[PDB]
Amino acid sequence: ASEGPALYEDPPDQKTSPSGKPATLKICSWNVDGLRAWIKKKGLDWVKEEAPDILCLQETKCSENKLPAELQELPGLSHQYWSAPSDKEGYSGVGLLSRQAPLKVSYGIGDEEHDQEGRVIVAEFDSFVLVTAYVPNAGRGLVRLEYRQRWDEAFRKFLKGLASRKPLVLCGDLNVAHEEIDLRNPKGNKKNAGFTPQERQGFGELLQAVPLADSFRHLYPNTPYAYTFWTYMMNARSKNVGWRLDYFLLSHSLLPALCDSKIRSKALGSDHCPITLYLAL
Ligand SMILES: [Mg+2]
């Protein structure tokens, strides 16, 4: 009620690095709010336009055994990997679709407590490791906040381990708006999932410990009203009353390869929009 529209126009795609090196890798990440729902809402139209080298999907609500046939309409992303909850049901779930097969694909974070909900794919390539995640939400009434804190610690420790061997790119729906600039209404959301001090602090801990840089915020440190999620309710997207929940976090060693980190605000299909990373690897 207190918010009207706030403008955001994502800047043009910067496709060369500081060294002048053209981008060699384009990664698109997207919380699809259910793979079938997303397909019905023309989600694949953006994927075809974007033509990424790697597509990471969160909240697929689908196991590798029950995938929709339409995913065959992406022949340029022929190597497809899927994780889903162990109970074999339609919730959570992540996907990674790639032009080239990774050297190795793994699922989860090496901890039984945290590996039952199909939340993480690890894809190792020659020069870097890619992780895509759908981080557990703290829940309505914060009923899952204690668990989320345990998740955060385990995930941080796991990523620090990976980064000790190869440069890391982490992408996906991290279910937190880091700072006040990362959501439209910080004042009214400090007791809500995604903007609790515990969640924000966890994100800060992750950046420091691994370490990782927030690609978007690194490039655009002072840019407001840049969001990746809007509630389906109450004209939130039309008013740009949103949250930045979706990130590409990078090892510091990859910052010289960083060309751009995009937010595809106008792309429909979900309550999140896609985000896209350009790297000159
Ligand atoms: Mg959803």
Swiss-Prot record:
Its EC number is 3.1.11.2, 3.1.21.-. Mg(2+) 1 binds at residues 31, 59, 271. Phosphorylated. Phosphorylation by kinase PKC or casein kinase CK2 results in enhanced redox activity that stimulates binding of the FOS/JUN AP-1 complex to its cognate binding site. AP-endodeoxyribonuclease activity is not affected by CK2-mediated phosphorylation. Phosphorylation of Thr-196 by CDK5 reduces AP-endodeoxyribonuclease activity resulting in accumulation of DNA damage and contributing to neuronal death. It is found in: Nucleus; Nucleus, Nucleolus; Nucleus speckle; Endoplasmic reticulum. The modification N6-acetyllysine is found at residue 160. The record marks 246 as: Important for catalytic activity. It comes from the Eukaryota. GO terms for cellular component: centrosome; chromosome, telomeric region; cytoplasm; endoplasmic reticulum; mitochondrion; nuclear speck; nucleolus; nucleoplasm. Its cofactor is Mg(2+); Mn(2+). The modification Phosphothreonine is found at residue 196. The active site is at residues 134, 173, 272. Changing residue 173 to A/N: Abolishes the AP endodeoxyribonuclease activity. Reduces protection from granzyme A-mediated cell death. The record marks 175 as: Transition state stabilizer. The record marks 272 as: Interaction with DNA substrate. Changing residue 262 to A: Reduces the interaction with TOMM20. Abolishes localization in the mitochondria. Residues 252-281 are annotated as: Mitochondrial targeting sequence (MTS). Extract of mitochondria, but not of nuclei or cytosol, cleaves recombinant APEX1 to generate a mitochondrial APEX1-sized product. The specific activity of the cleaved mitochondrial endodeoxyribonuclease appears to be about 3-fold higher than that of the full-length form. Multifunctional protein that plays a central role in the cellular response to oxidative stress. The two major activities of APEX1 are DNA repair and redox regulation of transcriptional factors. Functions as an apurinic/apyrimidinic (AP) endodeoxyribonuclease in the base excision repair (BER) pathway of DNA lesions induced by oxidative and alkylating agents. Initiates repair of AP sites in DNA by catalyzing hydrolytic incision of the phosphodiester backbone immediately adjacent to the damage, generating a single-strand break with 5'-deoxyribose phosphate and 3'-hydroxyl ends. This is DNA repair nuclease/redox regulator APEX1. It comes from Homo sapiens.
